[PDB]
Design a protein around this ligand. Structure first.
Ligand SMILES: [Zn+2]
Lengths: 171, 67, 148, 52, 191, 121
RNA sequence: UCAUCUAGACAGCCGGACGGUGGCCAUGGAAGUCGGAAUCCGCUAAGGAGUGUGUAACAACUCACCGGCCGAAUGAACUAG
């Protein structure tokens, strides 16, 4: 859906042999708290020997964007499962916030590789603080000095089923 | 004689271009394009008309001849 | 007037070259054999200068030949046609002498360089009691003066 | 005998070509893929067989 | 990958004048005039300083930016064809039967006729496209020269004359007979 | 690696400019490596010959521009195939040797820079 | 995933592409190019004890390397929609 980012902090259940476990923390892009906690336990079952019955979640907090009106370039490292194997990819997206960047990332992977939400693993997402570290041409195209371009062929959708003059596509 | 072309200029999108919000919650106010996200969407701001600073798809605004 | 150069194992085709110069093959061979005095045992470049009557034979200096000669070699019949792999002592003085003998002929870049090139020429020869030929040439500055 | 230069000029159009191994198409001599759809633009090409 | 702006340039010499309404190009020079419809290719033209014209495409795909350099080459070919002209020299190649080429007139249409190509009784006639002048050149044996403004018309007429002399049911690596284009250049080459 | 080799070139050039007051710019066309090698040997004692990519050289001179400002005048002359001769001998003797050697069917000295002064010669 | 890149990259033209040295065995010969091993120096801006054509062996031509013009990304191998 429209994604939100949460921090989820959890731990193992405390025993007498070891009280105070190590309080692992992860950042999850998810639609809501339930999906966020499910993905948290999914990745902790991939990492450490723990499961939901043997552990607990001590905190979940929404992390909204610090500057939601700054235009950033993000580099995203992703695992995905194809029909024959597992691959790593690095894609970079020029967008205004992290949740919108990963939303366009999920759309991009589903469009160009037919990869689903169950197949995509988000390794990391990070803002590229400096230009000329941008490595893709499709985003390096929009970083030029005095960028301007026209929008040819305007199509205006009509409300009536009949129009009384030939329309114009000037913009 | 001299060479003649038909120029055919139209309404470039760049910073400082004044746009009119076509549909949405503003829906009829003016804004100024602050920056260009990509080919299809831009970051605008309309601070006199009460339009909050936001990223918006270019299909939801109409570009005006004002710069 | 005409100079012809051939690589000849000593003690000895030649005739084909000789016919153009109208010189007897046997006479040329005898002259070459005498010149091979330098070594004969091994192949060496021989320069024949033709005066339009007779050809004079001299042995032009060659790095491989000089190096092979320097390595002490028991005379080989070559009927065996054995590999005859050449093993040699360091012979640092001989190589320096060889570099001096070259005397930067054909413009060797430096006196030290001429020696280094001479060392490289010993691809065939071991050229050292315990080392790869010219391996230590970069390491040691000794003998630079000797080559000059 | 034609002439040597004129044989060269005629052989430029008739003999200095390549042949697709799949669909026998006569192709440019420096080509990498066949221009035909029916072989699927394959890169199995051979030189056209000369005389002599 | 949707290149948002790609752009080529064409240089306009002192003698020519180029008129571009919507996508119809008219080039007028010393040797005459030429025109071209380009409403199928969807580019935009812009005169800079009366000797430079930029052609551009915005938000174009790979095929579209290929077509941009194609249309630049076409209009530049038109400009250099109305300035210098275009001249194709072709040579006659035969083994035994000499090829006898003349110019005839069925209903005033300037046909080029080809006789005795490999000794046949059939007479091959190729029509001549307008604007193309054909001269049977002296001082070089068996050479024909086609000149004009349009590279399309000149090279197509030369190609029709080449294709009309194809050999059937024989090994064509041995039967090399025909009429082949040997030189392509300008009428005022090395100007 | 590539940069390292390049860095060495920049350094040697700077040293050469400092070492010799007299600079000869020589243009080489159709000169064989063997032809070049012979010239180098003849002039080994009194002259230094340097060959390099022009793009590389121009940047170096601009980099070393603050010191040795007069060398800036040499930059217009650098265009085209060029070689640099650094020599103790003031002028004609070096020039005579370069032109004469290895003329076959051809080294030419395009310009001479000595002591901040440029001579067409 | 490797490499090259405004200190000038990849295409296209143009120039050089050298000495020790005909490196060592082996052959009637094989000198970079029938093979077996080694495969190193000098001069370098740069040039392999050779990429092919190439001759009985040469000679000759071309390469991969460096240079002028060009001024900005490109080459190889692989993966999957
Ligand atoms: Zn095919």
């Amino acid at each position: 859906a429209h994604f939100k980012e949460y921090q989820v902090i959890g731990r193992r259940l405390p025993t007498e042999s070891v009280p105070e476990p190590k309080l692992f923390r992860m950042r999850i892009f998810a639609s809501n708290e339930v999906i966020a906690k499910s993905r948290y336990w999914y990745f902790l079952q991939k990492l450490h020997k723990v499961k939901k019955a043997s552990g607990e979640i001590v905190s979940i907090n929404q992390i909204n964007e610090a500057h939601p009106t700054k235009v950033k370039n993000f580099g995203v490292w992703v695992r995905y499962d194809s029909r024959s194997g597992t691959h790593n990819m690095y894609k970079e997206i020029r967008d205004v916030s992290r949740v919108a960047a990963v939303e366009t990332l999920y759309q991009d992977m589903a469009a160009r590789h037919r990869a689903r939400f169950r197949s995509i693993h988000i390794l990391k997402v990070a803002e590229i603080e400096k230009t000329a570290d941008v490595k893709r041409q499709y985003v390096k195209q929009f970083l030029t000095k005095d960028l301007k371009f026209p929008l040819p062929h305007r199509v205006q959708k009509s409300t009536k089923t009949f129009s009384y003059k030939r329309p114009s596509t000037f913009y | 004689t001299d060479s003649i072309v038909k120029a055919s200029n139209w309404r470039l999108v760049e910073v400082g271009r004044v746009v009119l919000i076509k549909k949405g919650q503003s829906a009829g106010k003016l804004a100024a394009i602050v920056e260009i996200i990509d080919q299809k969407k831009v970051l605008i701001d309309g601070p006199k008309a009460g339009v909050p600073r936001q990223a918006i798809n270019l299909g939801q605004v109409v570009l005006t001849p004002l710069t | 007037v005409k100079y012809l150069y051939l690589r000849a194992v000593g003690g000895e085709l030649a005739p084909k070259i000789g016919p153009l110069g109208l010189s007897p093959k046997k006479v040329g061979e005898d002259i070459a054999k005498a010149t091979k005095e330098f070594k004969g045992i091994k192949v060496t470049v021989q320069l024949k200068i033709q005066n339009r009557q007779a050809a004079a034979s001299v042995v032009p200096s060659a790095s491989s030949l000089v190096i092979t000669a320097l390595k002490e070699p028991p005379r080989d019949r070559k009927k065996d046609k054995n590999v005859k792999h050449s093993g040699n002592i360091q012979l640092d003085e001989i190589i320096e002498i060889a570099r001096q003998m070259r005397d930067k002929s054909f413009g060797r870049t430096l006196a030290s360089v001429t020696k280094e090139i001479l060392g490289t020429a010993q691809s065939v020869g071991c050229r050292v009691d315990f080392k790869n030929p010219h391996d230590i040439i970069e390491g040691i500055n000794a003998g630079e003066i000797e080559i000059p | 005998i034609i002439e040597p230069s004129l044989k060269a000029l005629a052989s430029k159009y008739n003999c200095d070509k390549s042949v697709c191994r799949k669909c026998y198409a006569r192709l440019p001599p420096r080509a990498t893929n066949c221009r035909k759809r029916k072989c699927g633009h394959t890169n199995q090409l051979r030189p056209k067989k000369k005389l002599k | 990958m949707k290149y948002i702006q790609t752009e080529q340039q064409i240089e306009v010499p002192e003698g020519v004048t180029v008129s571009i309404k919507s996508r119809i190009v008219k080039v007028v020079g010393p040797r005459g005039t030429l025109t071209k419809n380009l409403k199928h290719i969807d580019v935009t033209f812009t005169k800079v300083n009366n000797q430079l014209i930029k052609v551009a495409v915005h938000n174009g795909g790979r095929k579209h930016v290929a077509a941009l350099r194609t249309v630049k080459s076409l209009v530049d070919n038109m400009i250099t064809g109305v300035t210098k002209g275009y001249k194709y020299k072709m040579r006659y190649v035969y083994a035994h039967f000499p090829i006898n080429v003349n110019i005839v007139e069925k209903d005033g249409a300037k046909f080029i006729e080809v006789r005795n190509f490999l000794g046949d009784k059939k007479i091959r006639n190729v029509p001549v496209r307008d604007g193309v002048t054909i001269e049977f050149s002296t001082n070089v044996k068996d050479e024909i020269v086609l000149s004009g403004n349009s590279v399309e018309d000149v090279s197509q007429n030369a190609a029709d004359l080449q294709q009309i002399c194809r050999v059937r049911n024989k090994d064509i690596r041995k039967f090399l007979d025909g009429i082949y284009v040997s030189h392509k250049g300008f009428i005022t080459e090395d100007l | 690696g590539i940069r390292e080799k390049k860095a060495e070139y920049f350094a040697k050039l700077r040293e050469y400019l400092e070492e010799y007051k007299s600079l000869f710019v020589v243009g080489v066309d159709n000169v064989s490596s063997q032809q070049m090698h012979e010239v180098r040997k003849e002039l080994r004692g009194r002259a230094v010959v340097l060959m390099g990519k022009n793009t590389m050289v121009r940047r170096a001179i601009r980099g070393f521009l603050s010191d040795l400002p007069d060398f800036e005048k040499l930059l217009p002359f650098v265009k085209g195939n060029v070689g640099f001769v650094f020599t103790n001998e003031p002028l004609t003797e070096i020039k005579n040797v370069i032109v004469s050697n290895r003329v076959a069917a051809g080294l030419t000295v395009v310009q001479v820079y000595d002591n901040g002064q440029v001579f067409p010669s």
